[PDB]
Scaffold this active site. Structure first.
Site, mmCIF file in Angstrom:
data_model
loop_
_atom_site.group_PDB
_atom_site.id
_atom_site.type_symbol
_atom_site.label_atom_id
_atom_site.label_comp_id
_atom_site.label_asym_id
_atom_site.label_seq_id
_atom_site.Cartn_x
_atom_site.Cartn_y
_atom_site.Cartn_z
ATOM 1 N N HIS A 84 0.823 -1.214 0.000
ATOM 2 C CA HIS A 84 0.000 0.000 0.000
ATOM 3 C C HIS A 84 0.856 1.262 0.000
ATOM 4 O O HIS A 84 0.713 2.112 0.888
ATOM 5 C CB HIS A 84 -0.974 -0.028 1.171
ATOM 6 C CG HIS A 84 -2.081 -1.008 0.964
ATOM 7 N ND1 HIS A 84 -2.164 -2.192 1.647
ATOM 8 C CD2 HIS A 84 -3.120 -0.993 0.119
ATOM 9 C CE1 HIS A 84 -3.219 -2.852 1.249
ATOM 10 N NE2 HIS A 84 -3.815 -2.144 0.318
ATOM 11 N N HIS A 124 -6.404 7.385 -3.075
ATOM 12 C CA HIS A 124 -7.394 6.451 -2.460
ATOM 13 C C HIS A 124 -6.843 5.628 -1.281
ATOM 14 O O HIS A 124 -7.638 4.936 -0.601
ATOM 15 C CB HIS A 124 -8.025 5.550 -3.515
ATOM 16 C CG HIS A 124 -7.239 4.323 -3.788
ATOM 17 N ND1 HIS A 124 -6.211 4.320 -4.689
ATOM 18 C CD2 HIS A 124 -7.304 3.086 -3.267
ATOM 19 C CE1 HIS A 124 -5.656 3.128 -4.710
ATOM 20 N NE2 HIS A 124 -6.296 2.353 -3.853
ATOM 21 N N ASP A 125 -5.521 5.669 -1.056
ATOM 22 C CA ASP A 125 -4.858 4.965 0.039
ATOM 23 C C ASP A 125 -3.867 5.855 0.814
ATOM 24 O O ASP A 125 -2.962 5.320 1.461
ATOM 25 C CB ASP A 125 -4.101 3.752 -0.498
ATOM 26 C CG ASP A 125 -4.945 2.507 -0.637
ATOM 27 O OD1 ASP A 125 -5.934 2.377 0.108
ATOM 28 O OD2 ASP A 125 -4.583 1.671 -1.478
HETATM 29 C C1 FFZ Z 1 -2.592 -9.580 -5.324
HETATM 30 O O1 FFZ Z 1 -3.593 -10.230 -4.535
HETATM 31 C C2 FFZ Z 1 -4.388 -9.459 -3.719
HETATM 32 C C3 FFZ Z 1 -4.718 -8.126 -3.964
HETATM 33 C C4 FFZ Z 1 -5.529 -7.427 -3.082
HETATM 34 C C5 FFZ Z 1 -6.025 -8.041 -1.933
HETATM 35 C C6 FFZ Z 1 -6.919 -7.373 -0.937
HETATM 36 N N1 FFZ Z 1 -7.538 -8.149 -0.113
HETATM 37 N N2 FFZ Z 1 -8.449 -7.572 0.723
HETATM 38 C C7 FFZ Z 1 -9.501 -8.480 1.254
HETATM 39 C C8 FFZ Z 1 -10.228 -9.194 0.118
HETATM 40 C C9 FFZ Z 1 -8.872 -9.435 2.254
HETATM 41 C C10 FFZ Z 1 -8.421 -6.242 1.102
HETATM 42 O O2 FFZ Z 1 -9.281 -5.787 1.841
HETATM 43 C C11 FFZ Z 1 -7.301 -5.395 0.543
HETATM 44 C C12 FFZ Z 1 -7.530 -3.880 0.671
HETATM 45 C C13 FFZ Z 1 -8.476 -3.359 -0.352
HETATM 46 C C14 FFZ Z 1 -8.757 -4.000 -1.467
HETATM 47 C C15 FFZ Z 1 -8.205 -5.339 -1.842
HETATM 48 C C16 FFZ Z 1 -7.068 -5.843 -0.920
HETATM 49 C C17 FFZ Z 1 -5.707 -9.378 -1.683
HETATM 50 C C18 FFZ Z 1 -4.901 -10.096 -2.566
HETATM 51 C C19 FFZ Z 1 -4.565 -11.456 -2.269
HETATM 52 C C20 FFZ Z 1 -4.254 -12.555 -1.932
HETATM 53 C C21 FFZ Z 1 -3.972 -13.874 -1.483
HETATM 54 O O3 FFZ Z 1 -3.226 -14.611 -2.128
HETATM 55 N N3 FFZ Z 1 -4.555 -14.197 -0.316
HETATM 56 C C22 FFZ Z 1 -5.555 -15.254 -0.245
HETATM 57 C C23 FFZ Z 1 -6.976 -14.735 -0.272
HETATM 58 C C24 FFZ Z 1 -8.039 -15.595 -0.526
HETATM 59 C C25 FFZ Z 1 -9.346 -15.127 -0.533
HETATM 60 C C26 FFZ Z 1 -9.605 -13.797 -0.288
HETATM 61 C C27 FFZ Z 1 -8.565 -12.935 -0.032
HETATM 62 C C28 FFZ Z 1 -7.255 -13.396 -0.026
HETATM 63 MG MG MG Z 2 -7.453 1.138 0.521
HETATM 64 ZN ZN ZN Z 3 -5.793 0.418 -2.830
#
Ligand code: FFZ
Ligand code: MG
Ligand code: ZN
Length: 333
Positions: A84, A124-125
């Protein structure tokens, strides 16, 4: 905030980006960062070129200099965390550009709204510390306490918005200074609504709302435009898996390291560590990415494309091929 100096601007204007097409869906920000000894300047230059090349700032009375000032004020407020950081928001900016112009989503919005999206990507971050909303609440951190007290659990997103409003309060860095009345109001409200919508706690309801609006021939136009904006910032925010596989992988490495560092700090503070934040669980990148693809990203992109953004079909295609490549990593392990 301290005004941006001429030397700060020049250091960006110097960067030439030889061999890079910043408008391309296969543009590689990691390659851009490696290309040079001053990656922060090159990143700024990418953002600058994207915005000027759009033709949008010029149309809204935003000078080349106020644009560059804004970009550099945003840059100052990103930290040296693994994911981030400034590169993420530049990446989201670049990605949104592709969605608008290569995916023809620009057709769904006004020029002002396109301008706002590209600008919002960079705010946004702001001042992300490498910790998610949940950490602040679980640890009863001061920021967490304030969020609970004031009745808004989007801890970081409200903070980002706060700092965006600060940057924009100075005319020298206010990319919306050329606006007044209802246009200036729409710019700020839509920017803020978009940032608030990046809280993944609201993912399902944002997606549902957009899909319902898009299916309804009689949706309020203003509302459809706003939800389209929200969905596009969200889309850019989870766009890592829509990239060519080696770009996609580098992003997953960085986010995984950020998660693990949060997990470390949670351990030290004796609060709950989820498996995905826990170094000791040692979970394979391939299964991580497949899970993210299956449970979050592939449904998201497929549904918005099918509902309305047919031009962004390539995102669904790349997710599919990325999933197959991760499955081949499993198959051959
Ligand atoms: C480049 O991959 C990624 C890119 C982004 C994110 C983000 N996750 N989340 C949430 C969904 C936990 C956030 O709130 C972050 C902040 C805002 C938006 C999205 C961000 C996760 C992964 C990953 C992974 C990874 O292998 N874990 C395994 C995994 C399996 C299922 C669900 C989530 C993760
Ligand atoms: Mg954010
Ligand atoms: Zn972001």
């Amino acid at each position: 905030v301290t005004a941006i100096t001429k030397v700060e601007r020049e250091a960006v204007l110097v960067c030439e980006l030889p061999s890079f097409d910043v408008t391309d869906v296969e543009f590689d920000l990691f390659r851009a960062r490696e290309s040079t000894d001053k990656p922060l300047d090159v990143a700024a230059a990418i953002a600058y070129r994207l915005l000027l090349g759009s033709g949008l700032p010029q149309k809204f009375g935003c000078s080349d200099e106020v644009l560059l000032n804004f970009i550099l004020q945003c840059r100052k407020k990103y930290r040296n965390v693994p994911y981030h950081n400034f590169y993420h928001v530049v990446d989201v900016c670049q990605t949104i550009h592709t969605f608008l112009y290569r995916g023809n989503v620009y057709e769904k919005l006004t020029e002002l709204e396109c301008f706002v999206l590209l600008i919002t990507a960079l705010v946004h971050d702001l001042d992300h510390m490498g910790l998610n909303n949940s950490f602040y609440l679980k640890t009863e951190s001061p920021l967490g306490i304030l969020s609970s007290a004031s009745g808004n659990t989007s801890v970081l997103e409200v903070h980002h918005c706060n700092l965006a409003v600060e940057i924009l309060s100075d005319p020298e860095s206010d990319v919306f200074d050329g606006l007044e009345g209802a246009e200036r109001t729409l710019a700020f409200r839509s920017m803020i609504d978009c940032v608030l919508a990046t809280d993944m706690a609201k993912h399902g309801s944002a997606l549902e709302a957009f899909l319902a609006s898009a299916a309804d021939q009689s949706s309020d136009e203003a509302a459809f435009h706003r939800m389209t904006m929200e969905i596009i910032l969200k889309a850019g925010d989870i766009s890592n898996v829509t990239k060519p596989f080696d770009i996609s992988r580098q992003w997953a490495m960085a986010v995984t390291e950020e998660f693990y560092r949060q997990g470390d700090m949670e351990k030290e503070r004796g609060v709950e560590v989820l498996p995905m934040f826990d170094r000791s669980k040692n979970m394979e990148l391939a299964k991580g990415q497949i899970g993210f693809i299956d449970f979050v990203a592939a449904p998201f992109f497929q549904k918005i494309v099918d509902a309305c953004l047919q031009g962004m079909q390539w995102t669904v295609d790349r997710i599919k091929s990325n999933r197959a490549q991760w499955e081949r990593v499993l198959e051959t392990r």
